[PDB]
Design a binder for this molecule. Structure first.
Ligand SMILES: CCCCCCCCCCCCCCCCCC(=O)OC[C@H](COP(=O)(O)O)OC(=O)CCCCCCCCCCCCCCCCC
Ligand SMILES: CCCCCCCCCCCCCCCCCC(=O)OC[C@H](COP(=O)(O)O)OC(=O)CCCCCCCCCCCCCCCCC
Ligand SMILES: *[C@@H]1O[C@H](CO)[C@@H](O[C@@H]2O[C@H](CO)[C@@H](O)[C@H](O)[C@H]2NC(C)=O)[C@H](O)[C@H]1NC(C)=O
Ligand SMILES: *[C@@H]1O[C@H](CO)[C@@H](O[C@@H]2O[C@H](CO)[C@@H](O)[C@H](O)[C@H]2NC(C)=O)[C@H](O)[C@H]1NC(C)=O
Ligand SMILES: *[C@@H]1O[C@H](CO)[C@@H](O[C@@H]2O[C@H](CO)[C@@H](O)[C@H](O)[C@H]2NC(C)=O)[C@H](O)[C@H]1NC(C)=O
Ligand SMILES: *[C@@H]1O[C@H](CO)[C@@H](O[C@@H]2O[C@H](CO)[C@@H](O)[C@H](O)[C@H]2NC(C)=O)[C@H](O)[C@H]1NC(C)=O
Ligand SMILES: N[C@@]1(C(=O)O)C[C@@H]2CC[C@H]1C2
Lengths: 457, 469
């Protein structure tokens, strides 16, 4: 029933954000006492958010979440606007970061105490990606089994760190660090606090673009939000107990210094230390890049059938179906983030436009309650509970103008370049007839190049 | 739809497009191995990591000589139980140890009626002493006992026969280490007959019970050859002296003191302190106290301080007081003898709030001392500079390098920093960041420029610059 329903809700989350972010929230909050409050504010803020997409997902329910709900409210250039953002800002940078953490957990155990050269942690993040689409361009029945082993190694490394952290208090020096030094301090409340939350919410990502599928398989009709309060603080509990395993065994200086917080915890406890902590976490990050390529197929089928996304995208190979021109376009836009500089410059660049698009769908959810009632909502949320989300959410956007507009500036350049190609894409008067031959010339060229046939029609 | 279809496509795509799709795919996997083996080259050409040199606890921070307990707390609470309440202050200073004592029983000047096992009941009991260790070790502040036998008279080592004096010390090492102390300190071993022999035994007793236990020895000497004779067979012995007690006040002379002390020992672990018991103010004017401090915190070794050397405790600025043991000035009610003799910028409580005060300089260095992996165990290279300058660089492998420039002269000078001998890893940039300055009146963070660098009379600088090439 729901006992098998909770476990797949936990499976979407707890990817690889937990193996990066404790050096990021500890960097921007000073104290390890205040940095644990950030992991408690994120768990609550995801309860509020995922409970609305429990509601908003079940009203409309066409296919292709966060974009059809954008379509059914806006249905114009704002729907293509969110497809333009997510294809070029959110989904590539959500995959380059997880590909980068895979590289640093191979090279940091080899050194073990030096900064890994940046020009060699990028060319392993490309081999983590360019090999992994070539699996997914081959058969999915291999590719779903490979991912099935990568939720075991993820959950085994987490449960190891808890018992390795719990015994450290019990053995000797109970509350060995016990620091709450900047509990009154290092809290600018409009600067360093919010950038602790952009990172602390990266480790909870995934509650939105995958939580639709849980409902229709168990046919609970309305029993799903009963699971979403049981499931998600249990996940928040797990993110708490690793931070206690980091804070008691390590110090507040080692966590600021290292690219890899997990291997310093791995060095303290034992001497094997090369078969355990980088292996069982190097398999965690290698599944989330793999788990982010199944979902890239499902999105282009939605966008192409409405008229956006030129039809070379979303076409399947005959033998061993695997949307080749879909998957090429994901990995090409992921590799162009190898021209970046540092991870937490990209997490602050990811999470700006992420929490913008999530706030737009819920405003669209709430303007669909002012206008157009009686659409037979099957879930009743409180009148201010999504409003309680939104004014909390729009706080994070506007305060990221006073703090670092170097990333938000150029990100508005790329979304105001999607408009230009909107008016050439779907507004366009089809008169000149060279390009309507030229599009058909290019489309048959790429189909002859990649051997792809259209969707069954 | 701009679709070219599925059944009609199979006729068009077959002819020679089988070969150029079989061969286009081969350039992928030959382009993948050119990125696989193109990333194995960079990891092999990448140099090494320098391993960490097995630091003990007395390598990672200062020490704090507490001589007279009755004058550290004051009148009324001059005891061991009153010491248990001050540890929340000492942890703010981030000292890693306390030289405590001597607290044993000395009647006066008697070999017969001086015992090293029994403490003086002016202080307390062993149950006060066992509580003191267990309370301090909760905070990771280690306790070192002072075992100088005759700590009340002229000769500290009892000018009569000497082996029974040594036999007491031979046995008290065995006893107190059972109680749980983490090291010992004897002083004034210029009044010890065959002094360099008994330490190597007492080193071996201290190493004969553990290896996180140290021994500190004091002397009044300032001669180099007298010191190195005591360090001949001994190597893991900390030796405080008066090697820097001579005034000099010229940078090229202090450079001649320190570099010769390092070159004679080679590279071993020193212990930088001006004196074995006395304060910094006893040898210095009050405008040089902010200047020896930084040097003490940057030179390779364990700095050892006496109490009140962080607040500039001078005994001569407060009459009606014992020079050997001054009165700690916590606040305005710390000197009950004369009312109104203490100003507001002369106390612990008054200097605990000013960001410019001398105690505020101490917590900024003792923070950066036991956290920067350069300053803990970095190699050391001083280099030539102007006439009144002492300049040097501390650097570990790829961590944040440092640069200290000191002005022992009363003329506003320029830098004139030319390296010309520093290695490839320690080559200097032109622009370099600032961390702090001794005299206030700088932009603490503005990246300074070394060729356009001037100094004020008696002002020192702690720059830092990251690893680059
Ligand atoms: C990078 C991945 C390559 C492998 C996959 C091939 C994909 C090819 C297309 C890539 C871009 C796909 C998104 C295009 C934006 C959406 C447009 C849309 O929705 O139209 C629907 C529209 C309808 O298609 P239908 O449904 O098939 O009729 O399709 C088109 O209009 C195709 C238009 C192609 C050109 C787009 C505009 C480009 C303007 C700037 C051109 C600059 C060229 C470079 C200049 C020289 C530089 C050196
Ligand atoms: C920094 C860049 C270096 C690394 C990336 C290099 C770029 C290579 C392409 C991007 C990533 C490729 C991933 C590998 C995919 C192959 C997986 C596989 O084995 O499938 C078998 C798949 C099916 O086998 P078949 O039975 O032989 O058809 O083989 C292919 O279809 C060929 C795949 C190779 C395509 C590489 C070049 C693509 C040409 C794009 C031309 C676009 C022009 C028009 C649009 C332009 C708009 C601006
Ligand atoms: C202790 O120091 C002595 C020399 O100063 C080292 O050799 C010992 O010498 C004494 C002579 O008084 C002998 O009784 C010991 O048996 C010697 N120790 C041996 C042979 O191990 C000695 O190496 C030092 N102790 C340690 C632990 O290094
Ligand atoms: C250490 O302090 C003493 C105390 O003044 C210095 O003087 C010695 O004093 C003792 C007796 O008090 C005499 O027997 C010595 O002859 C004195 N030394 C000299 C050189 O005359 C002693 O010099 C100081 N030690 C050093 C190395 O300077
Ligand atoms: C001080 O360090 C220098 C190396 O920088 C060495 O001094 C050499 O000593 C020998 C013998 O006295 C001379 O022939 C050389 O010319 C000296 N070289 C220099 C550069 O001064 C030596 O390692 C140290 N000095 C001593 C006395 O050990
Ligand atoms: C506390 O600070 C004040 C202000 O800096 C000091 O007052 C000056 O001290 C210097 C040297 O002691 C004198 O030359 C000046 O004449 C003093 N100025 C005034 C207006 O009195 C004061 O001395 C400091 N306290 C102590 C104990 O040094
Ligand atoms: N939502 C993520 C997952 O693990 O699925 C994706 C990115 C990396 C970690 C979190 C953000």
């Amino acid at each position: 029933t729901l006992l098998n329903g909770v476990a797949i809700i936990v499976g979407t989350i707890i990817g690889s954000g937990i193996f990066v972010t404790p050096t990021g929230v500890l960097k921007e909050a000073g104290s390890p006492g205040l940095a644990l409050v950030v992991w408690a504010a994120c768990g609550v803020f995801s309860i509020v958010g995922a409970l609305c997409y429990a509601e908003l997902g079940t009203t409309i329910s066409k296919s292709g979440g966060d974009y059809a709900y954008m379509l059914e409210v806006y249905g114009s250039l704002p729907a293509f606007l969110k497809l333009w953002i997510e294809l070029l800002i959110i989904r590539p940078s959500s995959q380059y970061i997880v590909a980068l953490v895979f590289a640093t957990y191979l090279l940091k155990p080899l050194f073990p105490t030096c900064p890994v050269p940046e020009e060699a942690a990028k060319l392993v993040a490309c081999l983590c990606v360019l090999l992994l689409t070539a699996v997914n361009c081959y058969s999915v029945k291999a590719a779903t089994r490979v991912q099935d082993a990568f939720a075991a190694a993820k959950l085994l490394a987490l449960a190891l760190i808890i018992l390795l952290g719990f015994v450290q208090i019990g053995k000797g020096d109970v509350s060995n660090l016990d620091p709450n030094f900047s509990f009154e301090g290092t809290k600018l409340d409009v600067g360093n606090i919010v950038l602790a939350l952009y990172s602390g919410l990266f480790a909870y990502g995934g509650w939105n673009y995958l939580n639709f599928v849980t409902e229709e398989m168990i046919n609970p009709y309305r029993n799903l939000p009963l699971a979403i309060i049981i499931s998600l603080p249990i996940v928040t509990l797990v993110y708490v107990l690793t931070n206690l395993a980091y804070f008691t065994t390590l110090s507040t200086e080692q966590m600021l210094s290292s690219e890899a917080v997990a291997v310093d915890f791995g060095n303290y406890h034992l001497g094997v230390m090369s078969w355990i902590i980088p292996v069982f976490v190097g398999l965690s990050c290698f599944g989330s890049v793999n788990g982010s390529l199944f979902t890239s197929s499902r999105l282009f089928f939605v966008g192409s059938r409405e008229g956006h996304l030129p039809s070379i995208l979303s076409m399947i190979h005959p033998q061993l179906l695997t949307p080749v021109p879909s998957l090429v376009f994901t990995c090409v836009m992921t590799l162009l983030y190898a021209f970046s500089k540092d991870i937490f410059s990209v997490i602050n660049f990811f999470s700006f436009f992420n929490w913008l698009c999530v706030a737009l769908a819920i405003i669209g959810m709430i303007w669909l309650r002012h206008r157009k009632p009686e659409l037979e909502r099957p879930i009743k949320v409180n009148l201010a509970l999504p409003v309680f989300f939104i004014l909390a959410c729009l706080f994070l956007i506007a305060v990221s103008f006073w703090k670092t507009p170097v990333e938000c500036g150029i990100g508005f350049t790329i979304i105001l370049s999607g408009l230009p190609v909107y008016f050439f894409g779907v507004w366009w008067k089809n008169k000149p007839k060279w390009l309507l031959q030229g599009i058909f010339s290019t489309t048959v060229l790429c189909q002859k190049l990649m051997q792809v046939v259209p969707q069954e029609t | 739809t701009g679709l070219s279809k599925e059944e009609l496509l199979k006729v068009a795509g077959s002819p020679g497009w089988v070969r150029t799709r079989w061969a286009l795919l081969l350039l992928f996997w030959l382009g993948w191995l050119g990125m696989l083996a193109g990333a194995v080259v960079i990891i092999v050409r990448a140099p090494r990591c320098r391993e960490l040199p097995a630091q003990k606890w007395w390598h990672t921070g200062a020490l704090y000589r507490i001589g007279d307990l009755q004058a550290f707390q004051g009148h009324g609470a001059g005891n061991l139980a009153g010491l248990k309440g001050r540890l929340d202050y000492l942890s703010s200073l981030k000292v890693k140890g306390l030289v405590l004592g001597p607290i044993h029983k000395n009647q006066k000047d008697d070999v017969a009626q001086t015992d090293l096992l029994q403490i003086d009941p002016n202080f307390g009991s062993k149950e006060d002493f066992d509580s003191l260790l267990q309370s301090a070790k909760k905070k990771s502040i280690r306790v070192i006992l002072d075992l100088t036998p005759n700590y009340r008279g002229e000769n500290s080592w009892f000018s009569t026969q000497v082996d029974t004096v040594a036999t007491k010390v031979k046995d008290a090492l065995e006893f107190w280490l059972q109680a749980g102390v983490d090291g010992f300190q004897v002083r004034d071993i210029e009044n010890l007959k065959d002094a360099s022999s008994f330490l190597a035994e007492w080193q071996n007793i201290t190493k004969g019970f553990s290896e996180d236990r140290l021994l500190i020895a004091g002397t009044n000497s300032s001669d180099l050859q007298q010191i190195l004779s005591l360090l001949e067979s001994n190597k893991d012995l900390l030796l405080t002296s008066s090697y820097l007690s001579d005034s000099g006040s010229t940078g090229e002379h202090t450079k001649s003191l320190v570099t010769q002390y390092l070159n004679a020992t080679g590279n071993r672990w020193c212990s930088w302190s001006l004196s074995q018991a006395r304060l910094l103010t006893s040898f210095l004017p009050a405008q040089l106290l902010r200047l020896y401090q930084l040097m003490l915190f940057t030179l390779p070794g364990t700095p050892v301080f006496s109490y009140g050397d962080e607040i500039g405790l001078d005994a001569a600025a407060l009459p009606g007081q014992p020079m050997e043991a001054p009165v700690m000035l916590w606040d305005e009610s710390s000197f009950p003898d004369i009312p109104g003799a203490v100003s507001a910028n002369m106390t612990v409580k008054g200097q605990s709030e000013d960001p410019g005060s001398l105690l505020s300089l101490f917590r900024r260095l003792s923070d950066q001392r036991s956290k920067e992996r350069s300053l803990l165990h970095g190699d050391f290279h001083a280099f030539s500079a102007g006439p009144g300058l002492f300049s040097y660089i501390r650097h570990w492998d790829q961590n944040e390098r440092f640069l200290v420039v000191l002005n022992f002269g009363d003329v506003g000078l320029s830098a004139g920093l030319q390296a010309s001998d520093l290695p490839a890893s320690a080559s200097l940039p032109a622009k370099a960041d600032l961390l702090l300055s001794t005299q206030p009146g700088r932009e603490e963070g503005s990246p300074l420029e070394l060729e356009r660098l001037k100094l004020e009379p008696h002002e020192g600088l702690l720059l830092r610059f990251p690893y680059a090439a």
